[PDB]
Amino acid sequence: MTDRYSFSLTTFSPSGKLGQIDYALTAVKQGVTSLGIKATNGVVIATEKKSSSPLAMSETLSKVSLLTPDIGAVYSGMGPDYRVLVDKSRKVAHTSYKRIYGEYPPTKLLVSEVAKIMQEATQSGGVRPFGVSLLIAGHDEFNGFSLYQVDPSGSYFPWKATAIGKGSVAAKTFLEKRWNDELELEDAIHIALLTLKESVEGEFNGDTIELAIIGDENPDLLGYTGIPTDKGPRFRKLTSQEINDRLEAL
Amino acid sequence: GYDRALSIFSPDGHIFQVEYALEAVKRGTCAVGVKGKNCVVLGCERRSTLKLQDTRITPSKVSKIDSHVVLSFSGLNADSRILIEKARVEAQSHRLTLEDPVTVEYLTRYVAGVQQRYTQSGGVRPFGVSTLIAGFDPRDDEPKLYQTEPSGIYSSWSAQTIGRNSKTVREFLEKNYDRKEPPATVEECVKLTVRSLLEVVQTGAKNIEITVVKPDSDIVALSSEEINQYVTQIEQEKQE
Amino acid sequence: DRGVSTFSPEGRLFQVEYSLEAIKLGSTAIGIATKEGVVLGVEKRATSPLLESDSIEKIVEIDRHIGCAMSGLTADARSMIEHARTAAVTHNLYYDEDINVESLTQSVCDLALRFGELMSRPFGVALLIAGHDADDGYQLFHAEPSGTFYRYNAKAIGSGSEGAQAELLNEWHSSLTLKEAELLVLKILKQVMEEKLDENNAQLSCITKQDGFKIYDNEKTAELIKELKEKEAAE
Amino acid sequence: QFNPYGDNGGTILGIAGEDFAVLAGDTRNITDYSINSRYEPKVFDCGDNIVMSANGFAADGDALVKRFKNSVKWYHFDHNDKKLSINSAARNIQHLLYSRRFFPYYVYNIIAGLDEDGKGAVYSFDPVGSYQREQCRAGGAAASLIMPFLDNQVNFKNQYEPGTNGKVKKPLKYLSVEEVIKLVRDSFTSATERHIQVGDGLEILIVTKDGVRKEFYELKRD
Amino acid sequence: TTTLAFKFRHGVIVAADSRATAGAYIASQTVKKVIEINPYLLGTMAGGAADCSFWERLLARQCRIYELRNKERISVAAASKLLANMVYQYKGMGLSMGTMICGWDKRGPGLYYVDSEGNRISGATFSVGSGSVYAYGVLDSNYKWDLSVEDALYLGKRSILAAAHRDAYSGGSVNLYHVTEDGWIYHGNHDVGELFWKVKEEEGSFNNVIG
Amino acid sequence: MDIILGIRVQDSVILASSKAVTRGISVLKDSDDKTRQLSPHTLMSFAGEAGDTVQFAEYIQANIQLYSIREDYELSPQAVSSFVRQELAKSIRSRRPYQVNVLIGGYDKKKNKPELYQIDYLGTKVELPYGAHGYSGFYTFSLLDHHYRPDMTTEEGLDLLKLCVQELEKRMPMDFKGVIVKIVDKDGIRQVDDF
Amino acid sequence: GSRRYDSRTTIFSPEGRLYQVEYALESISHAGTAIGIMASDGIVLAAERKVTSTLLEQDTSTEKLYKLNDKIAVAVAGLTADAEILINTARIHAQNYLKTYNEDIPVEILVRRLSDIKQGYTQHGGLRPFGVSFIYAGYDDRYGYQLYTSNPSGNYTGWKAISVGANTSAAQTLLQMDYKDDMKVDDAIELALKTLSKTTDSSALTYDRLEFATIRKGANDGEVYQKIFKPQEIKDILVKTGIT
Amino acid sequence: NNYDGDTVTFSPTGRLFQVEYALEAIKQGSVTVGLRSNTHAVLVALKRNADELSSYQKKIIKCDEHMGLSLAGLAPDARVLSNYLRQQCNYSSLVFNRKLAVERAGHLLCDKAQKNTQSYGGRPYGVGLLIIGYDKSGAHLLEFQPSGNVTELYGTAIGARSQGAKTYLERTLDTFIKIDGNPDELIKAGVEAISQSLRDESLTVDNLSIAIVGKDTPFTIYDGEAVAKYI
Ligand SMILES: *[C@@](C)(CO)[C@](*)(O)[C@H](CC(C)C)NC(=O)[C@H](Cc1ccccc1)NC(=O)[C@H](CC(C)C)NC(=O)[C@H](CCc1ccccc1)NC(=O)CN1CCOCC1
Ligand SMILES: [Mg+2]
């Protein structure tokens, strides 16, 4: 046995292209649409819960994931790749930061660590790149609210608002017209639901849409009282009912 | 670990990777070595395709391995740094364990051995570098000039050149260099080295580097003006 | 591509057979064994007149009682010589005696097939290992990159090998003197060499019980060349 | 605390002649004040006309002999059935001993045979490989009892020629095998009287060009 | 043990006793404490017989491979340093060696003291062993540079005798060596028993002893 | 080894080191130089357990000489002293620590100032006008505290050093066989052949 | 076995070139142009962001100009993810040097170290090289202000003015024309922006498509200051030089 | 064809070509014969030279006092396998004070060769061996193929033209098996057997190599004037 693939599977072609990264980006293009919008007092991330079968319980499959109490993530592309990246991202937030500094990492540095993991899958021996693009929304004390995109290459960019996957080109155009620097969080949620309706074919309700926010601190979700400085997680996943309420005022 | 055999024999008994490494040397800038009666001179070509260069900080072509030995090269520049570092480490290791500085022959044998090792080790390619190693042994006044190449073979030379258009300058040296009476002085040795490079270089401005090594760790690099005076005198005699 | 340790349909290792082709391109080396000693001679083959020929070292001492000549990719021989010298001296450490020529040769040949995917390829050099010991007397061995070694009364390796071997077939007899063997190596080298044989482009050496392994001076070889010319002109 | 060493007693003796050599040793094996065996061989024919005896801590002695016998076997395989000379064996044994410089073989060791000129040879080893060719050597429990006797009766030490009064020494005349075996038996009979770990039996191995011969003599069993 | 060596005009003298001890018991009296590394290099032994023998024999093999690769006999300084670095690896582990590396090379006669503690010293006069302290008295008092070979050989011999007499763990016989630029020369084995009486009569020394 | 002293004056650094090497009850040598030139304007004296001292000094020497060749530039005495300290601080938590104390005397050609650093086997570094290792400072510091000025000449520094050595020779029970003295200044390193 | 699928990233071509290094350089030629200009009283680093969007958060964005320490900075051309791997290694090397010698690392030593890492990927390991070219701008007390470049081959050279990435041929010609030795920082700032403005593939050169930085002794007395320009500050210098 | 690049690849008909190519190297090798009675076992080997100046390559190797083999094919591979046998015979003696059974020696060689046929990177052994020995169950003869297959036989032959000697032994089976307590007659039958594989060349003094082991006979090799008796 032994892993005898100690050589790179991603290499430069004569034209300068890294083929496997391009092909990974093509897989991301085929994936279901997801988006993110940044407001003055929050960030929203959203996607469609594309259920593979009606017998399948789509509540058990979480496309939007908590990484830290103040950082959340959503993806487009290959689901299994995303699931393992979330596991690694959650762990690296502890091992490379929280266990050292005693606090959760700021958004940009956690993004930097995830990016590194994805870059290594693009150069290390005997592996293919991750077939996902991530959208990571988060908050921290000194940088405020922020939204980042991470690609299969490991490259990451900060966005005011953006979209990835199936109908990203049309969705990004829609967001350019609606976005301004004075948006409140509720306005951003409203715009997110409008943008996402264009890329969805079938049912459009709280059960087929997954949406989460980075906003105010939630002391009711903390689970304990007694420490003034601990005020609760800023990440919150909107319920099926909470989504439907905002679809009536749509 | 990556164990792949990159340097292997072909049906006609050739190791192509080693032979392709010699092609990288052929592409490299010209380097020349000439030993006089009491000195050795190392000449090096600088391609003038690169101007706006900062000549203060740009890596010089001739490298000191120890206070009494120098090394110039032709081929891949990045590869040469690895050999030079290894040679420098070995030079200090020899002083440390044997309480004498390396002989020029010993240092050459080490560098050549490193080059050979990279022609039959798994997962590595040969060095695309040929070197000219020159200097004087400790407490000796006999000039030493050696050459190495990617295959790992080495040998001593009265005068030798490597790199691009080395065929032309070797032709010049073969008819101009007399073994019975070598360049008696430093001037004659430098003049012959500059003359040989002028067959290939193009302009005699900032394209020629000269480094003179004398006995007892006396090593100095000539400046642009000093070299330019040689270039002037050579062509003025040529107009006849 | 294909494995480095692959057999051909004829039952030969591709790489070993290809390394033998590299040895055919090498400079000529000849060895002759007599009851008075073993003689080793080589073609230096300088690529240019500016190359100082005395730095070309194709004949090498392994121990006082064992010498060695090489042909092929000579850079590959350095680690083999190093191993041989270590093996010879190590045996002297463990057993307080000289090592048998055959045992030394066997130790060198054990390295040969240590290649795969250890070193990445076989050696591209053949060795003539000559020496003397108390048990089997004066001996000459031919060590190949296949791991095989044959003992020889006389042997030539390199570019002019098959032409030289046919000449050694006729000339060798069991009563050869050392002086006769010296002239015989010079004769056959002069025959297969491209350039004209002299003291600067050819080198002689021998191994005797009394004096041990010796590389001949250029002044000493020059006289043997002059002695050869006169005896050929004598008839 | 576990003590990996022990003392099994025993005493050995090697004497070199002009064209022969003997290696003798008692056959008694002991721990403390108990007898384990009255006949437990301690001197072995190791091949190539070499005899060997290593003991003190029996387990380490058995291992060393076993390893040297193995070394002889592999010397033949690797060097075309060449005969291992006594001087080559001695040097080989040094390296077997020093390989455990930091967990020594707790033994006295002596080998005997013939040198390459056919003359008798005896080599002596300390536990970590310091070896010496000698004419006469005793090792083990009663070594200090025997050696002074051999200095006197083999090398004629402190013996001068009558009439001269200390001016001229007794000349070093060689000894015969029969004369040597007498000194051996007298040495071990004397050692048996005054040393409690020596007794029961005496086994002698004689080495000539013809081969290796054995002789056995009883000793006191108290 | 008692061993000594000293540089002088005509090379270097090396002398040593031959006694080996195991407590109060004299195990041997025929030990060669001078090892011939090469025709131009000698090594002395003091302390652990096994240790000194093994490491100096292993050094002689290092010095030989040096000659093969370099076509040049090793220097006294390089040889002494190879030993020193070898024993330094096992420092604190229990090694017991007190050696002198004597020879003639390009810089002329050379003499280095090397021990298991880590010392490596160049010097014109050394003496190591339990009886060294007695030998130093005779050396220091009679040592010149302009000493004849005959007188130098006697000095080294007389110095060992002084130590062999007083030191209980020194004696047996004296081994002499003289190292020239043409190599070392063995100058015999001299029984102390016979040598003592001879020196007493010819020199007049040891008046306190009766004979 | 025994006594190593150092004094930084106006334009130079002076290092005085004992000559004796001792094995038990016997003086093996009386002319030992307990110093290595690390670079043309940096000198290091040393003292500690046998073997460790020379092995460490020569190891440092090799590293600084390697740096000099690689960069064609001489490291500042401060940079060298920091390198040495790290090697000793690394050593002290190793399986078998180097038992060595050093003084580093150098002339910084950039600042045109002499500099003296004292470093013990633990990796404890201190820059000083004068310093000593072992039992040396116990006898000498009172004289240095009294007589030392920072504007002293090299000749005045040597006279004060003679006074320090005279006190050592009077009150120390051990005979250290005098000292080898070396001066480090702008022109390099030299030995005072008469002291 | 696995041999079947090995691309063999570290081999010579018959012409004596390294395939992957050459193809990596081809990749870098499509990256945004980065320019470095060295003056007597400072260094300028200018670089063009690649086809941005209006929704990109520029003030918190960094894809071209990175800080290695207080004295040294780099401009990037190629794969950003690959560059960040190397940048973090260089930051660690600079701190190791500072811890060892208690002095800031000389510029060349840092450059040589990174270039040696790049070289290693071309000679052993069987991995693809880093698709990155750097422009190093830095200062130390030996050589003063220095500009270097390194590429995937691991080869590095010193410069007075240099460009990497797209349109370097055109850019280098323009720099060679207008550059002079007695030039100052303010003049060098103008030269860098003018060169980008002429070589750019975009319709017009604006503040949102640029990253800019200077290394000046224009810090209070004998010391060096790094200035990574803000979006508003790039907008002002574009008006000052007369481009917008 | 497409399935002979390495040892780890079966062909569509279930064949291992690299093993078959290794088997081919044996057929190119010089002839060697093995046969036994109830008391003794004999090896006879035709040695091969490079030319008239060269020596004749040795074919027979001793493994222990009671066991040894003859080779045909790559000689270095025989040195590796015989060295392994020497160690295994030796392990049995040192640990169990037991002479290694010839049948068990065959099982060990089989398993060592097999590992080289199932793993990537390595290669099969390119040599065939004839092992003879005398143990607690009497005389034995084994044939080793580098495919891994080991076979106990009354007699056999391997190498070039080995079919001639193998046919002779198949006829003589009933005769030579009964040659008990007569070493010279058993060798005669072996020398007569190997003679059936000769063409052009004949058995000379430095050409022939014989080895024998038996009840009160340690494994000994005969070369030179020691085999002139049987010519
Ligand atoms: C003078 C004579 C003494 O100082 C010299 O220094 C000589 C130098 C010569 C021999 C090269 N040194 C000795 O004689 C030396 C003194 C000594 C002893 C032990 C350790 C260090 C130094 N003696 C030996 O080395 C003897 C030599 C024998 C008698 C031939 N060897 C022993 O005593 C051995 C070695 C033991 C040993 C060393 C290191 C690790 C483990 C073991 N020991 C024994 O034989 C056991 N000994 C037998 C006597 O009863 C007590 C146990
Ligand atoms: Mg009793």
- Tell me if G225 sits within 8 A of G219, measured CB to CB: yes
Ligand nearest to the CA of D7: 1
Segment holding H81, helix H or strand E: helix H75-96
Q: How far apart are CA C181 and CA F138, in angstroms?
A: 80
Look up residue E97 and give its two tokens.
Answer: 């060696």
**Centroid of ligand 2 to alpha carbon of D6 (angstroms):** 20
The amino acid sitting at A9 is L
Q: Tell me, which fold does domain A1-250 have in CATH? A: Glutamine Phosphoribosylpyrophosphate, subunit 1, domain 1 (3.60.20)
Does any CB of chain E come closer than 8 Å to the CB of residue D113? no
Ligand nearest to the CA of D194: 2
Chains in contact with H via at least 3 Cβ–Cβ pairs below 8 Å: C, D, G
Per the listing, tokens 């009296």 go with E29
Query: What residues 23-62 of chain B have any CB closer than 8 A to a CB of chain F?
Result: none
Taken in order B148, B151, B152, B154, is the CA torsion positive or negative?
A: negative
> Which has the closest alpha carbon to B125: B39, B20, B221, B29?
B20
Is G13 close to B54, i.e. CB distance below 8 A?
A: no
Chains in contact with C via at least 3 Cβ–Cβ pairs below 8 Å: B, D, E, G, H
Domains held by chain G: number: 1
CATH number for position G63: 3.60.20.10
- Tell me if D105 sits within 8 A of D97, measured CB to CB: yes
- Tell me if D108 sits within 8 A of D140, measured CB to CB: yes
Q: How far apart are CA F8 and CA G147, in angstroms?
A: 39
Per the listing, tokens 């002002």 go with G236
Look up residue H37 and give its two tokens.
Answer: 């009675």
The amino acid sitting at B222 is L
CATH number for position H165: 3.60.20.10
What phi, psi does B89 have (nearest 5°)?
A: -65, -45
Q: How far apart are CA G78 and CA A154, in angstroms?
A: 13
Q: Where are the beta strands (DSSP E) in B28-128?
A: 31-35, 40-45, 63-64, 69-75
Q: How far apart are CA A179 and CA A162, in angstroms?
A: 10
Ligand nearest to the CA of E129: 1
Residues near ligand 2 ion, CB 5 Å cutoff: D 192, 199
CATH number for position E61: 3.60.20.10
Residues 6+ apart with CB under 8 A from D191: D11, D142, D145, D146, D198
Does any CB of chain F come closer than 8 Å to the CB of residue E140? no
Binding residues of E for bortezomib: 49
Overall resolution, Å? 2.7
Look up residue C23 and give its two tokens.
Answer: 């040895």
Q: Directed axis angle between helix A168-178 and helix A185-199, to 10°? A: 150
Q: How far apart are CA D149 and CA D141, in angstroms?
A: 15
Q: How far apart are CA B151 and CA B9, in angstroms?
A: 13
Residues 6+ apart with CB under 8 A from E25: D143, D144
Strand partners, B219: B213
Q: How many Cα atoms within 13 Å fall on the side-chain side of residue H24? A: 13
The domain in which residue E80 lies consists of 1-211
Distance from CA of C160 to the nearest CA of D (A): 34
Quote the DSSP letter at residue C53: G
The amino acid sitting at G92 is I
Q: How far apart are CA B201 and CA B231, in angstroms?
A: 12
Q: How far apart are CA B213 and CA B221, in angstroms?
A: 9
Which one of F64, F70, F71 makes the best mutation probe of the G interface by having the most chain G beta carbons within 10 Å?
A: F71
Ligand 1 pocket, E183 CB below 6 A? no
Domains and CATH numbers, chain C: 1-235 (3.60.20.10)
> Which has the closest alpha carbon to E126: E117, E118, E136?
E136
The domain in which residue B116 lies consists of 1-240
Is E54 close to D144, i.e. CB distance below 8 A?
A: no
- Tell me if H114 sits within 8 A of H81, measured CB to CB: no
Total Cβ atoms within 10 A of residue A135: 26
Strand partners, E22: E25
What phi, psi does A244 have (nearest 5°)?
A: -60, -35
- Tell me if C184 sits within 8 A of C171, measured CB to CB: yes
Residues 6+ apart with CB under 8 A from G45: G34, G35, G36, G65, G73, G75, G135, G137, G212, G213, G214, G215
Task: Provide the phi-psi class of A105: left if phi over 0, else alpha when psi is between -120 and 50, else beta.
Answer: beta
Residues of C within 8 A of D88 (CB-CB) are 95-97
Q: How many Cα atoms within 13 Å fall on the side-chain side of residue A163? A: 28
Domains held by chain B: number: 1
CATH number for position B221: 3.60.20.10
Which one of D110, D130, D159 makes the best mutation probe of the E interface by having the most chain E beta carbons within 10 Å?
A: D130
- Burial code of D206-218, b = ≥16 C-beta within 10 A, e = fewer? bbbeeebeeeeee
The amino acid sitting at H115 is K
Is C93 close to E57, i.e. CB distance below 8 A?
A: yes
- Tell me if H155 sits within 8 A of H103, measured CB to CB: no
Domains and CATH numbers, chain F: 1-195 (3.60.20.10)
Q: How far apart are CA C11 and CA H18, in angstroms?
A: 9
CA angle A53, A54, A57 (to 5 degrees): 90
Q: Write down how long chain F is.
A: 195
Q: How far apart are CA F187 and CA F165, in angstroms?
A: 26
Q: How far apart are CA D149 and CA D145, in angstroms?
A: 8
- Tell me if C200 sits within 8 A of C43, measured CB to CB: no
> Which has the closest alpha carbon to H138: H174, H110, H180, H108?
H180
- Tell me if C181 sits within 8 A of C32, measured CB to CB: yes
Residues 6+ apart with CB under 8 A from C123: B120, C19, C72, C73, C76, C77, C80, C111, C112, C145
Is E61 close to C93, i.e. CB distance below 8 A?
A: yes
Distance from CA of H7 to the nearest CA of G (A): 10
Look up residue D4 and give its two tokens.
Answer: 């990996």
- Tell me if G70 sits within 8 A of G115, measured CB to CB: no
- Tell me if H196 sits within 8 A of H170, measured CB to CB: no
Q: How far apart are CA B180 and CA B186, in angstroms?
A: 17
Residues 6+ apart with CB under 8 A from E29: E18, E19, E20, E171, E172, E173
The domain in which residue G229 lies consists of 1-244
The amino acid sitting at G83 is A
**Closest atom of ligand 1 to CA, residue D104:** 41
Does any CB of chain G come closer than 8 Å to the CB of residue F72? no
The domain in which residue H34 lies consists of 1-231
Q: Reduced to 3 states, what is the DSSP secondary structure of residue B149? A: coil
Segment holding G213, helix H or strand E: strand G210-216
> Which has the closest alpha carbon to E99: E86, E89, E143, E107?
E86
The amino acid sitting at H59 is K
Helical spans, DSSP H, in A31-167? 79-93, 99-101, 107-120
Does any CB of chain E come closer than 8 Å to the CB of residue D126? yes
Q: How far apart are CA E174 and CA E19, in angstroms?
A: 10
Q: How far apart are CA F168 and CA F170, in angstroms?
A: 5
Ligand 1 pocket, E46 CB below 6 A? yes
Look up residue E175 and give its two tokens.
Answer: 């081994």
Distance from CA of G225 to the nearest CA of B (A): 22
> Which has the closest alpha carbon to G21: G103, G109, G127?
G127
What phi, psi does E59 have (nearest 5°)?
A: -70, -40
- Indicate which residue's Cα is closest to atom 47 of ligand 1: E22
Ligand 1 pocket, E31 CB below 6 A? yes
> Which has the closest alpha carbon to H190: H220, H216, H212?
H212
Instruction: Sort strands F130-133 and F179-185 into parallel, antiparallel or unpaired.
Output: unpaired
Chain Cα centroid distance, residue G85: 15
Residues of E within 8 A of B113 (CB-CB) are none
Domains and CATH numbers, chain D: 1-222 (3.60.20.10)
Q: How far apart are CA C55 and CA B186, in angstroms?
A: 25
> Which has the closest alpha carbon to G172: G160, G184, G180, G162?
G162
Q: How far apart are CA C199 and CA G27, in angstroms?
A: 58
Q: How far apart are CA A162 and CA A36, in angstroms?
A: 6
Query: What residues 89-118 of chain C have any CB closer than 8 A to a CB of chain E?
Result: 89-90, 92-93
Look up residue H34 and give its two tokens.
Answer: 């093995």
- Indicate which residue's Cα is closest to atom 50 of ligand 1: E22
Look up residue C147 and give its two tokens.
Answer: 């791991």
CA dihedral B78, B83, B84, B86 (to 10 degrees): 130
- Indicate which residue's Cα is closest to atom 32 of ligand 1: E22
Residue E1 annotated among the catalytic residues of the structure: yes
Residues of H within 8 A of G6 (CB-CB) are none
Ligand 1 pocket, E22 CB below 6 A? yes
Q: How far apart are CA H52 and CA B236, in angstroms?
A: 69
Q: Reduced to 3 states, what is the DSSP secondary structure of residue C169? A: helix
